[PDB]
């Protein structure tokens, strides 16, 4: 199986909306998807499992959706503390491409 992330980078300002794209090579159910927040020099953490169930302790601006083979993470109101690389990978984690979100 194969997974692909797009776009490769993003630089925006606060109070705005970001939209990412995570696409599998085949049809994947809505359960084996999770979203990550990797900051440099830190410990990464879970943001969203099963593509809609919000992880405990992360704010409500991180909202994900999608089905079949098209998956999307969306930050509703961008913040200056959201500078991190964001990862979508499967259950067995055998893929991963990376997408960096910068602050303008």
């Amino acid at each position, epitope marked *: 199986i194969d997974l692909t992330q797009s776009p490769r980078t993003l630089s925006l300002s606060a109070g705005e909306r970001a939209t990412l794209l995570c696409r599998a090579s085949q049809s994947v159910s809505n*359960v*084996a998807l*999770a979203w990550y927040q*990797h900051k440099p020099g830190q*410990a*990464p*953490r*879970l943001l969203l*499992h*099963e593509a809609s169930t919000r*992880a405990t302790g992360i704010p409500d601006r991180f909202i994900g959706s999608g089905s079949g083979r098209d998956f999307t993470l969306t930050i509703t109101s961008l913040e200056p503390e959201d500078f991190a*690389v964001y*990862y979508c*990978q499967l*259950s*067995g*984690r*055998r893929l*991963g*491409q*990376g997408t960096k979100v910068e602050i303008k």
Partner: nanobody
Amino acid sequence: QVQLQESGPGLVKPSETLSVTCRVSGGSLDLYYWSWIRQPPGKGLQWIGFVYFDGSYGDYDPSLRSRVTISADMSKNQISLRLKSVTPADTAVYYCARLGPGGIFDRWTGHYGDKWLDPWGQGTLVTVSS
């Protein structure tokens, strides 16, 4: 609540055996899987493999299959990773985390609980030089 920490050497010459150790200090190894994740300094995150706490199941990366060995001790609260044929390309950062909610016990039922991946720990750096 569950706090875990990785450990290992810092300088590994080639043609050796890499060996790192992840220790849990917030609970048991029971009812969960245990995994390893690699990040090269230029690229992103890469998956190595994971093992079940009984030692009755393990899934591996097809690239790194025949040189890797993951083991876990239920009593000593630790997980050891071993890697053969150390190259300078293996200079990277290593991460240790427990896998999803499943406690799907057996060889006969089939290991079927694998959804998310909670705490990741700090990580370690392995540099390969002479």
